[PDB]
């Protein structure tokens, strides 16, 4: 009955991607193309943007854009990865803590474990590394191999999953090189791996157009959701009984585990979605369409063939640039939009 039109509150330089601090609603980390990322604070007085620190990566002895950023769960540390494969660890104030260099290809995913002592990193060539992030040492290295997928995930304080051949998902324990199990079901590269630490279920998405929910540490999946007609680009848990996904088919779909069925969906026919992100409170889902428009969907009533209510939209006819990434601040009142070429934008999300 009313769609909000979002406004920009802060203009950024061009950014490749960004991620807000998990515990401080005012701190944003963003990667840039010139082998550098920055930590910034955004506070209202209007809105003021202040750079906290520069997180620079040297060019290799031999383009080197920052391709990945990941805050620790406690929000005190952050890992940045660049095109040449190097990873650097920093404190939230900017101090360099450690240099973790082993990958030789662009970093695509970095996941921190529960207590902030280990991370799993994976590059475009699917080389996956388990690091003791404090000592900066390589504990395990995996080369299971086109792309096998672009995500990895921790499923316990000492257990994790990574994409394997032919759509399989391999399960590992920190102290063992041999997989403890294999999750077989997908028929294409793994695009998303999200573990829910409350219901203890793993959500996976694949280029095969399906989502799977896994309970067992080996074997078949608990749920398999068909519906998307093209690759799934993003997927998230919505509480403990639902999952939401978006795809290149231009649709956003909310699924029910309790009823094993599609609960609701919204679509912009012919307009692919490049990325989707769930808010901290799990009540809003923001997606970036190929046409440069950002739609924020409201899941509130659905959580209290149905359509997913459109809460707000961000767009303008002054440029036709693509949006490659978006991120929510922890309070859910700001979203950082990363355009492919033009300046980034921080937009306010009304409550």
UniProtKB/Swiss-Prot annotation:
GO molecular function: transcription corepressor activity
Subcellular location: Nucleus
Source organism, top-level taxon: Eukaryota
Chief place where the protein resides: nucleus
Keyword Zinc set for record: no
Keywords, comma-separated and alphabetical: Chromatin regulator, Nucleus, Phosphoprotein, Repeat, WD repeat
One of the protein's GO biological processes: regulation of DNA-templated transcription
Keyword Magnesium included in the entry's annotation: no
Segments annotated as WD repeats: 10-41, 63-91, 102-132, 146-173, 185-215, 227-256, 268-298, 317-348
Recorded GO CC terms: nucleus; Rpd3L-Expanded complex; Set3 complex
Miscellaneous section: Present with 1620 molecules/cell in log phase SD medium.
The protein's assembly and partners: Homotetramer. Interacts with SIR4 N-terminal domain. Interacts with a complex composed of SIN3 and RPD3. Identified in the Set3C complex with HOS2, HST1, SNT1, CPR1, HOS4/YIL112W and SET3.
Domain notes: The LisH domain mediates tetramerization and interaction with SNT1.
Function: Antagonizes telomeric silencing in yeast. May recruit SIR4 to non-telomeric sites or repression.
The name this protein goes by in its record: SIR4-interacting protein SIF2
